[PDB]
Structures are given as C-alpha cells and as structure tokens.
Design a protein around this motif. Structure first.
Motif, short mmCIF file in Angstrom:
data_model
loop_
_atom_site.label_atom_id
_atom_site.label_comp_id
_atom_site.label_asym_id
_atom_site.label_seq_id
_atom_site.Cartn_x
_atom_site.Cartn_y
_atom_site.Cartn_z
N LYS A 116 29.52 21.73 -10.84
CA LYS A 116 29.21 21.72 -9.41
C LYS A 116 30.46 21.49 -8.58
CE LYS A 116 24.66 22.17 -9.45
NZ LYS A 116 23.89 20.92 -9.22
N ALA A 126 18.95 6.77 -8.88
CA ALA A 126 20.31 7.09 -8.46
C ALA A 126 20.42 7.19 -6.95
CB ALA A 126 20.76 8.40 -9.11
N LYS A 145 18.11 12.31 1.23
CA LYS A 145 17.07 13.27 0.89
C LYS A 145 16.09 12.60 -0.07
CE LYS A 145 16.48 17.24 -2.13
NZ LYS A 145 15.57 18.16 -1.42
N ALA A 173 22.39 13.48 -0.90
CA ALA A 173 21.46 14.58 -1.16
C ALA A 173 21.04 14.63 -2.63
CB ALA A 173 22.08 15.89 -0.72
N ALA A 227 28.04 8.03 -8.15
CA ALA A 227 27.92 7.24 -6.93
C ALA A 227 27.17 5.93 -7.12
CB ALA A 227 27.23 8.06 -5.85
N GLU A 266 11.91 20.22 1.35
CA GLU A 266 10.87 21.10 0.85
C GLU A 266 9.51 20.78 1.46
OE1 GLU A 266 12.12 18.75 -1.20
OE2 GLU A 266 13.82 19.68 -2.22
N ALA A 314 15.88 13.96 -6.78
CA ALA A 314 15.07 14.00 -7.99
C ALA A 314 15.21 12.74 -8.83
CB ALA A 314 15.43 15.22 -8.84
N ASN A 315 16.29 11.99 -8.66
CA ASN A 315 16.49 10.71 -9.33
C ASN A 315 16.29 9.64 -8.26
OD1 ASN A 315 17.20 8.59 -10.99
ND2 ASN A 315 19.00 9.62 -11.84
N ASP A 327 30.06 14.81 -6.64
CA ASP A 327 29.02 15.17 -7.59
C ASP A 327 29.37 14.55 -8.93
OD1 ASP A 327 27.06 16.50 -9.25
OD2 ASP A 327 26.88 17.99 -7.67
N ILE A 328 28.37 14.47 -9.81
CA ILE A 328 28.60 13.96 -11.16
C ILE A 328 28.80 15.08 -12.16
CG2 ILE A 328 26.29 13.85 -12.16
CD1 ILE A 328 26.84 11.01 -12.97
N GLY A 339 26.06 14.54 -4.14
CA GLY A 339 25.06 15.39 -4.74
C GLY A 339 25.12 16.79 -4.18
N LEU A 340 25.64 17.73 -4.97
CA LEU A 340 25.75 19.13 -4.55
C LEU A 340 24.66 19.93 -5.25
CD1 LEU A 340 29.61 19.50 -4.75
CD2 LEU A 340 28.25 18.98 -2.73
N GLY A 341 23.46 19.87 -4.70
CA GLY A 341 22.35 20.68 -5.16
C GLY A 341 22.15 21.89 -4.27
N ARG A 342 20.90 22.35 -4.21
CA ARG A 342 20.58 23.42 -3.27
C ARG A 342 20.60 22.92 -1.84
NH1 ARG A 342 15.20 25.09 -6.26
NH2 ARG A 342 15.46 22.87 -6.75
N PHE A 343 20.27 21.64 -1.63
CA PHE A 343 20.28 21.06 -0.30
C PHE A 343 21.64 20.48 0.05
CE2 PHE A 343 19.59 17.31 2.44
CZ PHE A 343 19.13 17.96 3.56
#
Ligand SMILES: Nc1ncnc2c1ncn2[C@@H]1O[C@H](COP(=O)(O)OP(=O)(O)OP(=O)(O)O)[C@@H](O)[C@H]1O
Ligand SMILES: Nc1ncnc2c1ncn2[C@@H]1O[C@H](COP(=O)(O)OP(=O)(O)OP(=O)(O)O)[C@@H](O)[C@H]1O
Ligand SMILES: Nc1ncnc2c1ncn2[C@@H]1O[C@H](COP(=O)(O)OP(=O)(O)OP(=O)(O)O)[C@@H](O)[C@H]1O
Ligand SMILES: [K+]
Ligand SMILES: [K+]
Ligand code: NA
Lengths: 215, 431, 431, 199, 215
Positions: A35, A78, A97, A71, A51, A119, A74-75, A30-31, A7-11
């Motif tokens: 990204k 997942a 996370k 990381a 993943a 956050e 939000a899901n 990442d999916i 997961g390559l988000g902001r975090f």
C-alpha cells in the motif's frame, strides 16, 4: 494545513489522492508495504508504520499535523487504540472511519472529533435511487427539506416553466435546469423542459414526492 | 529532490562567498578568481585548506565573511534556513521538515525541528563561552581589537571543525600552551561528536540510558583518540623535526593535540611535512574516519567504521549477525555503510589518480592532500600553495563531495528507478 | 580444520623447499638463510619477487626446485595431494572431499574430485604444448641445452602466474616479438581465468549455456583488459623511459603486455621504475584485483570486485537487489565478497605501515611493493633488492597471506562458536 | 543480586520493569522478537532466545544467576522443560508460574523451589472484595486471622475510637485510620465479620 | 518473434521448454519464486513478478512481445485482470488458458485473441480412446470428417489393401500404414496389413465406425 491519513484502503486512499490533487501536504501511513509503495506518487510522504504503537507514532512526526484521518474501519481494536493515542497526543481534529453502531459508540467516548460511515451513508443514498428511479442525487438540508436533482420524463417534454404550476400546487422552487449538458442557474419563466434534462428542485421532502408521482 | 536541494543550496553559498571575497573591500592583496573560489569553498565545506594566508590576504571584513561561511557550512545550509523561516514566523511544513531529515541524516522525522533549535542554541552558547576563555589568554598578547577578534574567529573555527587560523603558523606558537590546547580540543571534539550525541547526553545523565549510537560515539572516540595518541608519541619521540627538541610535558601536549586534530579539525602544533612516513600513514586511516553522522565533521563516520569492522569480525568468527553493545544491527544499516565506504574510496582513488596526472609532486603529499580534502580535515604536507589551476579545480570537487557526502551527491543525479520485479538467484564464487 | 590443513601444508612447502636451495648444488654463490627463505616463499606463493637473480644465483638443479615449487604452489597444495592419494589407492572419503572443497573455494562438494582430474590434466597439457611453441624461438638463440630449458621454465612460470625469468631482464629483450608476447599472454590469461571457467568453457560451446560466474569472467576480463590497455597506452605515450622510443607496432605490444601482466603474472616489457606516477596508481587498482576465483592467480578476485561494485551501484540507484546478467545475487554472496575486500585492505594497510617503519624508501615504491606482494604479482619499482632483513620478513608474511587468501588464513585461528540466540535491534546512524 | 526472567508476558514483563526500577541486573529472555524489543529498555540484558534448549541456556551464562523466574504459564511443555534444565544447571532458586492444578503437580516433582499462581491468588483476593464491599485489602496471617483494611460506613462517621468497643466486644484491634475513611483492623475471621455487620 | 509466457504451470512451463527448444526468445513470468528458478535455464529471460500489476508489467518491456500467453487457469481473478492489462497495452496476440465455461465468457468480453482449454481438449481426446480402443490418435477436419490412426486387429491380419473395400464400400481412404518403426505414406495396391500396425484412414466420421465394427 497538514494532513495525515492512517490506513490506505479504498476510503483512506481516496482522501490521500484528492488532498494531494488540491495541493496539500499529505502524510500517508499504512502497515502494508504494498500500500505504501502504491501511494508514494499520490502523497507527499508515505511511511510504513503500525499506528497502534505510540513509539512508531511519534517517529512519523504526528504532533505537527492539524488533521489526522484514521481510515481503518474493519479492525475495531486497531482503530480505537489509534484514536486513543492521537487524542492523548493533543491532536486537534481526529476523523475516524467507523464500521458498526457499537464502534461508533466507542469512538464517541474516547474523543473522536468526527466519525464517518462511508458505505452506510452511500447505501442510504443508493437505496433512495433504487426506490425512486426519478432521482439522481439529493442533499438533505434537514429531516423534512431537501434539494433533489430530478430526471425529466416523457410528460415533462415540451413543457415550459410557467406551464408547470410547481410553485403554487407543490410549493417547490426549481433551482436549475441541466439543459443538454449546460446548466441554467435560476431559470426564468419560461424555459421549455426537454425529454431528459436534470431539474434541480428544492422543496419539502414530502412535496417533491407528490411532484414525482403526479409528474 | 531533498538531496537535490542540498547540493544546489550548498553550491550557491560557494558562489556567494566567492563574490564577497573577490570584492576589493574584503582583501588587502589582489586575488585570483580560482583562489577566491578555493578559499570560499574551503570555508563552506569547512576544510581549512588555505592557498593564501588568511591573516594577511583578507581584511577584517574579509575574515568576517570567512566566519560567516564557516558557521553556515559548519552547521549546515538547512539549519539556518529553518531558523530564518521560524524568525519570519512562517510555518514549518512536512516538505520543509523532510529537508532537515535529509540534512541531519536522521531516519525519522520525529523531533527533527526541535533538534535544530537545540543544536543552534548549543552552538552559539559554547562558541560564546570558549571565545571568553580564549580571551583571557589572547587579549593580553594582541590587544583588544585583535585579541577579542582572534579568540572569536578561532572558537567558531574550532567548534565547526574548520582549522582556519589567522596566524601564519597554524597554532604552532602554542604547542605547550594548556589554555589553547584544552579549549580548542574541547571544541572540535564536542563539535564533531554529533548533534544527536550532545542532545542525548544533555537530556539523559546516565550512561545506561544512552542509545546505541550515543554509546558507540562516546566509547569509540575515547578508544580511537587514545590509540592515535599512543601511535604519535612512540613514532615521533626520536624525530628531530617534530617532538624532538621539546620537553616531556610538551611532548604529551603535542601528541594529544595531533591525536584528535585529524578528525577532522585540521589544526596543528607540529609540521606534518617533517613527520615520519609511519605517522602519516596512520593519519591517513585516522582522517578517513570522521566523527558523528549529524555533526560538523566529514569523512566516513566513526559509526560507519565500527559497523563495517564488526560485521566482518562477526563473519570471521562464524556469527550470523552483527552485535554491538548487546544490540543486533540490521541489514539496512550494513548496506548503507558499505556504500558510504566504497563510494568514498572510489572518489579518493579518482582524486589521487587525477592529481598524479596533473600535479608534479611527491606521491605521499598527493595522497595526504586527497584524504585531507575529502575528509575536510585540511592538513597539508606542503602541497596546497604549490597546486596548479587544474589541480585546485580537482580539490574543490573533492571538498564539495566530502562535505555533502558521497551518497547525497550521487542521489542528486541518480534517478531512483522503482520496480517490484525479482530475478532467479545466481551463483558466483567470490573467494 | 580444512583451513588448518591448507595453512600447515602451505607453510611446510616453504620450509622444505628452502633447504633444497641452501644446498651447495643449488647455488653458485653462498645464499643467506633469508634469501633462500624469500625465494622459496616467492615461488610457492607464485609471486616472483627476487632478492637475487634467479638465472645467475641458482644452477640447473636449483632452478628445477623452482619449477617444482611453482608447479606445486601454482595449482594449490591439495591439488597434488589428491593425485598422490589416488595413485597409492587410498579411498577418497567424505572427510578428504571436504578439504578439496575448501581448497578450490567451492560451495558444493558435487564433482569437486572430478574437477581435480580435469584441471591437472589440462595444466600439464597446456604447459607442454606452450613449451613446444616457444621452442621454435628460444632454441636458435640459446642452443638445445639452454633453449629447451628456457622454454620449459617459462611455460611453467607463465601459466602458473609466477613471473620468474632466467634472464637478467625479465622479458625486456622481447618487447616487439609476437611469439613471446602472444604465447605467454595466452598462458597467464587462461591460467588465471579460473579452473571452473575453463571446465565450463569446454563442456558447453555456447555462451548462453555458461554459468553466471563464467559469463562474468569472460566479460570482466575483456572489459578490464581493454580499459587497462587504453590507459597504459595513453598515459605512457610520450614518456621517454617507456613506450617513447618505440615504433607504433611495438607501442601496442608493450601496452598490451603491461595491461594484462598485473593480473597477476608479474612479467614486464617496460621498466616500471621509469613509469609515470599516474600509470602506477592505476596498476595498483589493477593488481589489487586478481583473476578468477579458483585459478593460479591471487588478490581479491575479479568476481569479488564486480559483486561489490554492482551492489553499491544498485543501492545508489534505489534498487533493492543486486542483478548481474538478469540474475539476482543473494546476501551470503555479498557478505563474503566484502569480508575478502575489507580483510585484504586491512592487511595491505598493515604491510604498508610496517614497511615505512622499517624501510627507508620512497613511499610509492613501498605502496607498489605491498600491493604486488599481497596480490602475488611480483612487479617491482626497485625495492626488493634493497630490502633489509626485517623488511624481507614482512614481505614473506604478506605473500603467505596473499596467496593463501585472507579468509582461509583467519579461519585457521578464529574460533567458530555457534549461538542460536538473537538480540534486539539497535539503531545507529551511518552517514 | 542478578535475576533472570524467562517469558515476557503480563506477569514476567511486570517483574522485569519492577526489578529494573529498584536497580537490579535483570536478564529478560523471550522467544518472541517483538516482546524483547519492547522490554529491551527495561532490562539490563535482553535476549531473543528459546529457553527449552540447553545450548541457548548456556549461551546466556544462566549459571551466574541466583534467581531464575520462569514466567511461562500457558505452555506446560515449555515451562516444564525449562525448569528441568535449570534444575540440571544447579540454579539455587527457580520460581515458576503455573497454569492449573496439574501443572503445579508436575513442577513440584521436577524441582521448582516456588510455584506461583498470579491470577488464582488475585482472583480469590478480588472475589473477597466482591462478596463484601466494605473490605478493600487484606492479608491472611493464618487461616482464621486477617488484617482487613475495612472502609468506614455512614454509621461510623463522627464516632471516636473509645466509643467503639472492638477491643472487648468483638476482640478486634484497630491499627490505623487513613483519612468514609480506611480503617485497618485485625482479628479473627469470624470476629471481623461481626464488626462489619454491626458497624 | 518474441514470446512471453505468464504463469509457469504444467501448461505454461511446457510452452517455455518447447519454444526454447526450437530457438525462440521467451520471457517466463511467474509469481512463484520456486517456479522461476526451475525455468530460469529453460527461458531466455525469467522474472519473478505479479502480472496483475501494471507497474511490474511495464518494467518487463511487455510491449515488445508480439505473443503473450497467459497460462493462469485456476485463478480467474489473476487471469482476467492480466488480459485486461495486456489488451490496454495493445498486445497483438493474447492467448489465454481458461478454466470453465464462465471463465471463457469473461475472456471473450475483454478481448482475448484466442482462448485455450488444455485439459478439456485432452479429456475429450482421451475419452474417444476409452470408448473405442481401436483408435490411437485422431484429428477432426470437421464435425463429420476425421483422420483416425487405427490399430490393426487379428481379422485384418494377412489382408491386402485391394482386399479391403474401404475405398468403395466404406468410402474411406487409407492414408498411411506404420510398420514397426517404418511408415508407408500413400500405399499403393497392394500392401499386406500386419498383426498390430497403424491404419491411418480418412473419411466420414460415421463411415469409419462401420469399418471398425465390421472389419
Ligand atoms: N494498525 C494499522 N496501522 C496502519 N494501517 C493499518 C493498520 N491496520 C490496518 N491498516 C491498513 O488500513 C487499511 C484499511 O484498513 P481495512 O482494510 O482494515 O479497513 P476497511 O474498512 O476494510 O477499508 P476500506 O473498505 O476503505 O478499504 C489497509 O490497507 C490496512 O493495511
Ligand atoms: N520456550 C520459550 N522460551 C522463552 N519464552 C517463551 C517460550 N515459550 C513462550 N515464551 C514466551 O513467554 C511469554 C509468556 O508466556 P505465555 O504467553 O504462554 O504465558 P501466559 O500464561 O499467557 O502468561 P501472562 O498471563 O503473563 O501473559 C510469551 O511472550 C511467550 O512468547
Ligand atoms: N498474478 C500472477 N502473476 C503471475 N503468475 C501467477 C499469478 N497467479 C498465479 N501465477 C502462477 O501461474 C502458474 C499457473 O497458475 P495456476 O497454478 O493457478 O493454474 P492451473 O490451472 O493450475 O495451471 P496448470 O494446470 O498449468 O498447472 C502458477 O505457477 C502460479 O504460481
Ligand atoms: K577541517
Ligand atoms: K606472480
Ligand atoms: Na494470564
């Protein structure tokens, strides 16, 4: 040390860039195709994968990584199915996370070694800065003791260290003084406090509140 | 950089072997700087093109260097590099695991180190066993110092698809011999079938559980070697030079041996210079195709040929997708294959063009030499000892690109320029 | 059925034209059933391979059948069939418009009938004017009876990419003559550049308004003729048989002429039997490539070659799409270009294989003849008069498939079954 | 025997894996690309096809299968159109998974040989175990007699079979004991409940 | 000059066709595949690219263009992010199409060289023609002076220039009088006005309105 970030988000994207800067082998998973193309330069290897599926997890070579950071925050589905596969793959350290309190309860059950609230932990730190305009950054050593980086007001200007009876009245020990961009580790009596210089002061959580109010 | 390390590391072994072969200790006769470089490059690229005879020109130490070059270049440079790292106890990182994925032509890094342990253990296991089976025939003929060594040299040379032989007649004294024919053909068929095909059959004992790649190689090798056996036997049955003054049992053995040896072992039982032009033309198509993506063979692989052939036939039948063994084959597979075949034909065409400028030779021998050097087969019609100094430099380049692959050689010096922009479609008539 | 009508109509023109040459009026000498069938097939396929000399074997009436077969075969079978139907007054339906779309290999049926009006009007115009330009030279040398017919025969021969010549030396007596060189090289360059290219050139007089195909053909022809002229001049500069005993002015004429004639006319000014093997190799790549998707030339077209070459280079550079002239090229264009190339190479391989079984000839002459026959060029090294009766029958089949196109020939007898079902993906390694 | 299973859901995916485990030729059809890729290894032949089209159904050689199972039970249009085609192709045995009572009535008209309610048959079976926790599994021979695998309570511990009067007092025949141990019993539906209450 | 037009809308696509008509090198960038295929023939170079990404923007050689016209005026995020990239790349002239008042103010902060409102400018010009049907087209020299191309009514028919008192009473100058495809620049006394003809006039804004009502 081998790291995989799922997961390559902001975090997640921040952990990939910071670990790669230090010179570590980071696998970025990442999916999203955009990204992965974005973090090709900031990771040792960047792979497009889902993943939640175990067959795509073993192709990455995921059993070779000591630390895996999931990381995705939000899901819930997942995130919890990913750390279920990694726990079943005997991954030693899984850092996840989380999103809410119930998501934290699920990851605690299914064997997450460390659960992170980026956050929520930053919102608590910001709300101390909004409530108290004097503080800039603080670290809670415990629930009652802390190191607070204060900001000098007008009444602390042209005041020496021995003039401030912080050691006796409040029981707080000044650790350092960020003097005009230059630090002063363990200042000796006495050093003149200027108009705006950071005062790293260690004491009880209630006692520094008195020092902020009484100036 | 994963393809750049392979090209640099493969080039360094050519330099190291050329130094070791050029020492006075490793040879009995004076050797040129190009012939020592050609012999070293023909060993690590695992071709078998011999300007000089291996048995007489080199000492026992010199032939021991050749076996080192054959084993290192046959199994790959990065295979032994990992084993050295694992023996020293150093951990295998993600960066070092990516080099193995590039060398073995694997798409994923899942279990790419565990394949190295299997392929190295399987290599020395079957080379040790076959050396013992060859010893029960070779030792009574050449004694103990030479019979045991010659069996050891040939078992390593056969398994790695090298074609190097100590005797001046390359296996031409064993045309009707079933012991040498069965053991040696068993080695380069399994040694070139693919390391992943062997790993799949070892762990899965039922044919329906095999992958698409394993079923493509097992069925494709059986069909291709059967058609080549039918072609050689029919065309050469009346030939006076080869297969004419032989018994019917020997005609079956020599045709079977010459059916499997162009892919890509390069050993022989018959003289290819006295064969008809019809069999040489079919052999050229035969040794343009190799066997196995991760193997000891070279050329465009058997799976590349089938993927291209089925893609065209499905298009000519009006089908919208490529289906082999009831499995769809995606567009990224079709595009790599095309590149491997188009780039390989371009390099072969450049070699034949450059050899015709340089060499004064019959055209059939020049085309046979370039296909044999690019596929790293090593069969000659009688040209390699007659090459010039300029000619051998071209063959050295062809053998180098042929082993490392045209794609990984181009990727060494092709800057992969990444851009996300697109363009409006164009209409060009390609009829 | 649109590919079936083309295949049936093309073959019948060979059989009908063969009887017209077997008549005692057509020829002075007795003509065999295979020589008449070869010359009939060598004309409607517009190849120019001659078993027997066209000027000496045939009379004026026999050569008039040749001009009819060249003209009918040069522009295509369905091109004249459109004119016949329009003259008689029958309505051109949608069913009849799909044959014309297939004949010109057009992807669109918009304006395909109007292109036949444009292309036939231009073709008869340019062959008539070019005869007048050649009339000022061939008439003082051969009188008015033969000089006017010599210019008329060659204007039809050169424009349609035939290479037939009345004289025993096919344009070897006019090496340094600019009138014969410039006019004839004007005809087969413009006649092979493409009918759609010439339509796009005339209606838009600015290069920026050209289509992608028109820009590809103008740049591709200029690039390829420049490299070919530099290669023939450099390689054959010191050769005594060709380009050696000539002035520097006449060296540039024969170098210019031999560079443009393999695509795909088949005239010559130097003897190809005395050329070096290095120059012959480049001619094979030259005459494997044709000129123009819809023209009088054949082989794999120049746009097919550029599409495959640019698609491979884009892959090797890591790009995800094929971009020529700032235009992306879609997947259906790429797969049709590779289907043409793979089918053509397999058929050429079958022709070379079958001729080595049949003919007892040097290998380079067999390879040069099969590329010439399949590409419908007609250049020789000295094999066509020496073919056997079985060898000639192979060339006729090769010339038939070469002119009609490999794809249209296969589409005649390949079942077109449409299934909407799909299959799960299978992974294969294509190293 | 050759079986075709159309629709690789939770129900159809189970039949493909089970029949493939027993060693049968199973054709697995599903309109979803990712479903077929997952079950490609668990079927002799797996096709990404839409079964409501007759042209795609004839492409699979569906006339060679004696048993066709239509495991579509959330799309009535896809399920009824499929079993009308298979009845047209003269399939000897079409087994359909139904959704509700009205889906059962459509498929009975259009010629389904057997109509299956997997969640409704299990839900009634589960709710019998919820109501009385003593039972573990049962099979209904008729509407009034059942072979209920009871669970022995604390009062049945250290009690011999001859001590139990289930044969005469309750009219129930004990069949097997699986060493609280599983106690397989047979009797009337009202008669078994007497033994559960009185131990 | 080399021009780049980013976003091929009704406004962006009109600049591509017009500048190509005049013979200029125009780069047409759009994120939509269908739009670029429409303007591929009306532009020197047409690219399907996202202009909010720096990597796609640097691939076009966007630093080689003197003028960039960002014709994205419904996506505020895409419009403001693009001109922030182009301002970083030192483009001499960035002309941006805005959406509302607030979008105008963001582009002013981040340094748009010229901000354009196509529908707001044309709406005001149309609403002047709806309010007064005698005007056909006009151009404002200032806030009180305008050049208005009027339409002649029946009362101005069969009247000469000297008969009209525009120069003295109204203080306005008649510039030109179109006559059925024929134009008379700077008329001299006297020319007879026809029934329905253009009456191009120049003067004070309020003085023209008095002329229209009275005559
Ligand atoms: N199954 C998956 N496997 C891998 N990556 C995934 C998967 N699902 C989502 N992702 C990727 O994980 C990344 C972060 O996840 P997501 O955006 O849902 O979390 P978040 O809590 O909003 O993150 P952040 O606020 O740090 O950006 C995204 O780039 C998303 O594409
Ligand atoms: N026309 C069709 N042909 C073939 N397969 C289909 C068709 N329509 C749907 N399917 C597939 O059938 C499968 C099962 O159908 P569906 O999901 O509607 O049933 P369900 O009631 O949810 O069943 P289950 O409880 O077994 O999941 C799905 O994977 C779906 O993609
Ligand atoms: N990030 C982007 N990069 C490039 N082009 C974009 C981007 N976002 C949108 N576009 C394109 O810009 C064009 C104009 O944008 P949009 O339609 O949102 O604006 P608009 O105010 O409706 O414009 P107009 O009135 O001219 O149609 C569209 O074709 C849209 O696809
Ligand atoms: K070899
Ligand atoms: K020709
Ligand atoms: Na269900």
């Amino acid at each position: 040390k081998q790291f995989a970030v799922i997961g390559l988000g902001r975090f997640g994207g921040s952990i990939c860039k910071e670990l790669h800067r230090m010179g570590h082998e980071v696998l970025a998973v990442d999916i999203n195709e955009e990204k992965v193309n974005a973090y090709a330069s900031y990771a040792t290897h960047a792979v497009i994968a889902n993943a939640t599926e175990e067959n795509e997890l073993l192709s990455l070579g995921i059993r070779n990584f000591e630390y895996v950071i999931v990381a995705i925050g939000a899901n819930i589905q997942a995130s919890t199915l990913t750390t279920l596969l990694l726990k079943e793959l005997d991954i030693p350290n899984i850092w996840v996370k989380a999103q809410n309190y119930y998501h934290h309860k699920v990851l605690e059950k299914i064997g997450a070694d460390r659960i992170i609230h980026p956050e929520k932990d930053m919102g608590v730190k910001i709300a101390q800065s909004l409530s108290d305009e004097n503080v800039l950054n603080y670290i809670d050593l415990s629930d009652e003791y802390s190191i607070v980086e204060l900001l000098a007001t007008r009444k602390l200007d042209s005041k020496s260290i021995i003039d401030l009876n912080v050691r006796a009245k409040y029981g707080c020990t000044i650790l350092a003084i960020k003097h005009h961009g230059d630090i002063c580790l363990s200042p000796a009596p006495e050093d003149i406090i200027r108009e705006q210089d950071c005062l790293v002061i260690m004491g009880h959580k209630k006692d520094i509140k008195r020092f902020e109010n009484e100036g | 950089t994963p393809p750049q390390v392979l090209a640099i590391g493969f080039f360094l072994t050519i330099i190291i072997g050329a130094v070791l072969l050029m020492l006075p200790i490793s040879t009995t006769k004076p050797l040129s700087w190009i012939d020592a470089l050609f012999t070293a490059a023909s060993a690590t690229t695992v071709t078998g093109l011999a300007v000089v005879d291996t048995g007489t020109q080199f000492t026992v130490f010199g032939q021991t260097v050749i076996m080192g070059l054959i084993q290192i270049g046959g199994l790959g440079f990065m295979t032994f590099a990992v084993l050295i790292v694992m023996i020293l106890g150093k951990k295998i990182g993600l960066k070092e695991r990516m080099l193995v994925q590039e060398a073995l032509n694997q798409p994923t890094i899942g279990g790419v180190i565990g394949l190295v342990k299997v392929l190295f253990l399987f290599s020395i296991s079957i080379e040790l066993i076959a050396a013992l089976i060859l010893s029960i025939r070779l030792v009574p003929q050449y004694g103990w110092s030479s019979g045991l060594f010659a069996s050891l040299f040939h078992a390593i040379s056969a398994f790695n698809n090298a074609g190097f032989s100590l005797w001046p007649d390359n296996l031409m004294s064993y045309v009707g011999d079933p012991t040498v024919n069965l053991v040696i053909t068993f080695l380069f068929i399994t040694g070139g079938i693919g390391f992943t095909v062997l790993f799949d059959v070892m762990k899965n004992r039922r044919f329906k559980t095999f992958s698409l790649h394993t079923k493509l190689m097992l069925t494709g090798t059986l069909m291709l070697n059967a058609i080549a056996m039918l072609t050689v036997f029919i065309l050469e049955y009346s030939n006076p030079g080869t297969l004419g003054h032989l018994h019917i049992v020997d005609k079956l053995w020599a045709s079977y041996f010459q059916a499997v040896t162009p892919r890509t072992a390069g050993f022989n039982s018959l003289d290819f210079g006295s064969m008809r032009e019809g069999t040489i033309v079919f052999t050229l198509l035969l040794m343009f195709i190799g066997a196995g993506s991760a193997s000891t063979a070279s050329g465009i692989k058997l799976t590349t040929f089938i993927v291209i052939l089925t893609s065209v036939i499905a298009y000519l039948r009006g089908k919208k997708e490529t289906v082999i063994f009831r499995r769809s084959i995606k567009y990224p597979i079709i595009i790599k294959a095309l590149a491997v075949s188009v780039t390989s034909l371009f390099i072969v065409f450049l070699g034949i063009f450059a050899l015709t400028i340089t060499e004064q030779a019959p055209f059939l021998q020049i085309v046979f030499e370039t296909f044999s050097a690019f596929g790293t087969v090593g069969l000659t019609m009688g040209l390699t000892p007659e090459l010039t100094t300029a000619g051998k430099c071209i063959i050295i380049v062809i053998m180098f690109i042929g082993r490392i692959g045209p794609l990984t050689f181009v990727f060494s010096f092709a800057k992969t320029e990444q851009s996300n922009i697109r363009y409006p479609d164009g209409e060009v008539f390609t009829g």
